[PDB]
């Protein structure tokens, strides 16, 4: 509260890399002057290494795992693009043109581009846009959590993702009055915004399955394909 509080800001800090286990060793400050299938692999293979990790961190969020089996893989499924970007967002330094994976690995902006074509721009603009709010750890790991913890069609027991939404948005409420109501508007704002952005991500995996250079990793075509509501 109290605990749960905590135990959300444990369970974001575990998901994540350390300051110290950054790693720049393919960083390039300066990129060099037409996608090819290198970008596309390293597109895929970006979007994969979060897979693990959501997961892992979604089961250490209180009364998640309590949810039924079917609900846990329909609510992971829905909102993985969406806590690929918002993390990413939050870790990324957007006034460098950094991209921080989850991985630890840093990135320069035009390292990516070619892979994730101008949905790499939308997501540092987010990003910016994010950093600008100054959202510390705690209301942070509130918001990641409310992302994955939503309404969703064909979930089992709607109810109890709803009372434990209103557990975490009480969390949430509760610590920006602590620390500081329109801030809270303002935070909770980023959830549509992420989701809009999420589209522009479904639209790039939609041009590359499109393309076939190399084809997405069965478990991001399956995301893709389930998170197609036609």
Same mark, same amino acid.
């Given at each position: 509260p109290?605990?749960?509080?905590?135990?959300?800001?444990?369970?974001?800090?575990?998901?994540g890399?350390?300051?110290?286990?950054?790693?720049?060793?393919?960083?390039?400050?300066?990129?060099?002057?037409?996608?090819?299938?290198?970008?596309?692999?390293?597109f895929?293979?970006?979007?994969?290494?979060?897979?693990?990790?959501?997961?892992?961190?979604?089961?250490?969020?209180?009364?998640f795992?309590?949810?039924?089996?079917? +609900?846990?893989?329909? @609510?992971? %499924?829905?909102?993985?693009? &969406?806590?690929?970007?918002? *993390?990413? $967002?939050?870790r990324? !330094?957007?006034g460098?043109?950094?991209?921080?994976?989850?991985?630890?690995?840093?990135?320069?902006?035009?390292?990516?581009?070619?892979?994730?074509?101008?949905?790499?721009?939308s997501?540092?603009?987010?990003?910016?846009?994010?950093?600008?709010?100054?959202?510390?750890?705690?209301?942070?790991?509130?918001?990641?959590?409310?992302?994955?913890?939503? +309404?969703?069609?064909? @979930?089992? %027991?709607?109810?109890?993702? &709803?009372?434990?939404?209103? *557990?975490? $948005?009480?969390?949430? !409420?509760?610590?920006?009055?602590?620390?500081?109501?329109?801030?809270?508007?303002?935070?909770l704002?980023?959830?549509?915004?992420?989701?809009?952005?999420?589209?522009?991500?479904?639209?790039?995996?939609?041009?590359?399955?499109?393309?076939?250079?190399?084809?997405?990793?069965?478990?991001?075509?399956?995301?893709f394909?389930d998170?197609?509501?036609?």
């Amino acid at each position: 509260p109290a605990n749960l509080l905590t135990s959300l800001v444990r369970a974001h800090l575990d998901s994540g890399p350390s300051t110290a286990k950054l790693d720049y060793s393919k960083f390039q400050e300066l990129v060099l002057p037409k996608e090819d299938a290198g970008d596309v692999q390293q597109f895929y293979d970006l979007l994969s290494g979060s897979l693990e990790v959501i997961r892992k961190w979604a089961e250490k969020i209180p009364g998640f795992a309590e949810l039924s089996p079917a +609900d846990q893989d329909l @609510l992971l %499924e829905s909102a993985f693009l &969406e806590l690929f970007i918002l *993390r990413l $967002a939050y870790r990324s !330094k957007p006034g460098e043109g950094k991209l921080i994976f989850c991985s630890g690995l840093v990135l320069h902006r035009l390292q990516c581009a070619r892979g994730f074509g101008d949905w790499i721009d939308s997501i540092l603009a987010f990003s910016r846009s994010l950093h600008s709010l100054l959202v510390d750890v705690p209301a942070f790991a509130c918001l990641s959590a409310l992302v994955l913890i939503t +309404d969703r069609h064909g @979930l089992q %027991e709607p109810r109890r993702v &709803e009372e434990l939404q209103n *557990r975490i $948005a009480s969390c949430l !409420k509760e610590h920006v009055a602590a620390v500081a109501a329109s801030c809270l508007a303002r935070l909770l704002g980023k959830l549509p915004e992420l989701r809009t952005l999420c589209t522009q991500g479904l639209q790039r995996i939609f041009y590359l399955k499109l393309e076939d250079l190399v084809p997405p990793p069965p478990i991001i075509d399956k995301i893709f394909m389930d998170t197609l509501p036609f």
